[PDB]
Amino acid sequence: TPDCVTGKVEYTKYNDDDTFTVKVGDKELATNRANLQSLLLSAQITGMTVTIKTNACHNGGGFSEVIFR
Amino acid sequence: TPDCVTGKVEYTKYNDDDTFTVKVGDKELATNRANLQSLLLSAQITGMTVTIKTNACHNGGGFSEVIFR
Amino acid sequence: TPDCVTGKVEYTKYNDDDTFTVKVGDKELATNRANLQSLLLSAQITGMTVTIKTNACHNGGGFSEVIFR
Amino acid sequence: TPDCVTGKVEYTKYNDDDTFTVKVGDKELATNRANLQSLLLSAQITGMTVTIKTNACHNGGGFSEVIFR
Amino acid sequence: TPDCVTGKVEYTKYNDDDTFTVKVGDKELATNRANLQSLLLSAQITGMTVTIKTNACHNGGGFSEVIFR
């Protein structure tokens, strides 16, 4: 799966449908994997660099793959 | 969904019905989303600014949408 | 539900029946809500003040309501 | 249940059968309670003193009762 | 189960199939145990030394056993 955006998490958002949005770089991307919520908030709090891989690389696009560095 | 309140979390409370209350600004709001409990307490401990979006913007109103900054 | 004890968490204990005991103030109180375990240990580690509300305000009494401040 | 060992956690280990081993003092003990995994690793990271209570107080013995101080 | 790699966690990755990859030493290894995701990310953030034991000791190999030191 290709890299879409790499960077620090600017903000996260919990959605009415239980999905979770993350803003990294110039894109807001959303995931339906509940296990990733606490992991992503942890990366945001600690300032980790994350890479989000997705073929839906556009604002509002979905993802499931994330590299935490 | 419109913004209701934005600010640091003053206190959180676990309710007898397993819902979770948060006090931000001048409003106590509650959520039935279990996944938000650990995320909100983490935001409270670390001093994050949160924005709660809800149409029930009154004391005791419910919500599901939260932006963590 | 009336306030029972307010203070820092002195110690916590995981019980054989999966309930969880917290000592706050002059009382040991126990809860059967699994979701509260990680929340309470977090309060203990970070030194938060908690208020436990319960009508069984005696040693070994049960609770479900907790305010994290 | 009698106290078995009190001390700081030296190391923890996740096992193939989903049990979790902890080395405290001179004993390696294991638990089948999944809820204790994140609580014990948190105690390990923060340097908390824990007391494990069990009648199987020997290497490889099981436990479920833990006091976090 | 034999020791495969020991070292600090270089990066972690959440996979489309809900498995979780860790890079330690010269190998990426992945686990299907959900419970390990938060524990491994915590090890990564705090700089713990982990030892992964597995008989599939090759890049992309699976594992379930990990020692956190």
Ligand SMILES: OC[C@H]1O[C@H](O[C@@H]2[C@H](O)[C@@H](O)[C@H](O[C@H]3[C@H](O)[C@@H](O)[C@H](O)O[C@@H]3CO)O[C@@H]2CO)[C@H](O)[C@@H](O)[C@H]1O
């Ligand atoms: O969390 C939401 C969602 O994330 C992942 O799927 C993403 C999009 O939601 C999905 O529409 C997209 O589909 C791809 C095909 O996989 C690809 O073969 C084709 O070339 O393009 C479409 C549209 O871009 O895939 C992305 C991930 O790359 C995840 O796979 C999915 O289960 C779900 O978790």
Ligand SMILES: OC[C@H]1O[C@H](O[C@@H]2[C@H](O)[C@@H](O)[C@H](O[C@H]3[C@H](O)[C@@H](O)[C@H](O)O[C@@H]3CO)O[C@@H]2CO)[C@H](O)[C@@H](O)[C@H]1O
């Ligand atoms: O966690 C509790 C609850 O939060 C969200 O719902 C909120 C209120 O509980 C709900 O009564 C309120 O409904 C609104 C409609 O959104 C609005 O379209 C209609 O005109 O008026 C009613 C009454 O105010 O909505 C808020 C959130 O905006 C969440 O949506 C719900 O699933 C549940 O989680």
Ligand SMILES: OC[C@H]1O[C@H](O[C@@H]2[C@H](O)[C@@H](O)[C@H](O[C@H]3[C@H](O)[C@@H](O)[C@H](O)O[C@@H]3CO)O[C@@H]2CO)[C@H](O)[C@@H](O)[C@H]1O
């Ligand atoms: O986690 C254990 C338990 O906590 C809460 O219940 C507490 C006691 O376990 C329960 O015996 C006690 O019952 C009260 C009645 O609610 C009250 O109406 C009556 O007058 O007195 C009895 C005895 O004090 O209530 C406390 C909490 O106040 C929680 O409600 C329960 O679901 C369970 O989680």
Ligand SMILES: OC[C@H]1O[C@H](O[C@@H]2[C@H](O)[C@@H](O)[C@H](O[C@H]3[C@H](O)[C@@H](O)[C@H](O)O[C@@H]3CO)O[C@@H]2CO)[C@H](O)[C@@H](O)[C@H]1O
């Ligand atoms: O997590 C594993 C396991 O821990 C707890 O049980 C422990 C041992 O695994 C169990 O064999 C042992 O049983 C004792 C009885 O307590 C005692 O009354 C009897 O006389 O002898 C046997 C020793 O062979 O007890 C320890 C804990 O004391 C936990 O109770 C169990 O449910 C399980 O979680």
Ligand SMILES: OC[C@H]1O[C@H](O[C@@H]2[C@H](O)[C@@H](O)[C@H](O[C@H]3[C@H](O)[C@@H](O)[C@H](O)O[C@@H]3CO)O[C@@H]2CO)[C@H](O)[C@@H](O)[C@H]1O
């Ligand atoms: O999380 C993935 C997976 O991890 C553990 O299994 C590992 C490999 O996935 C599995 O293919 C490998 O199988 C071994 C046999 O156990 C061994 O008897 C034989 O000699 O070699 C094969 C191939 O290497 O075992 C490793 C762990 O050593 C875990 O056991 C499994 O449940 C699953 O969680």
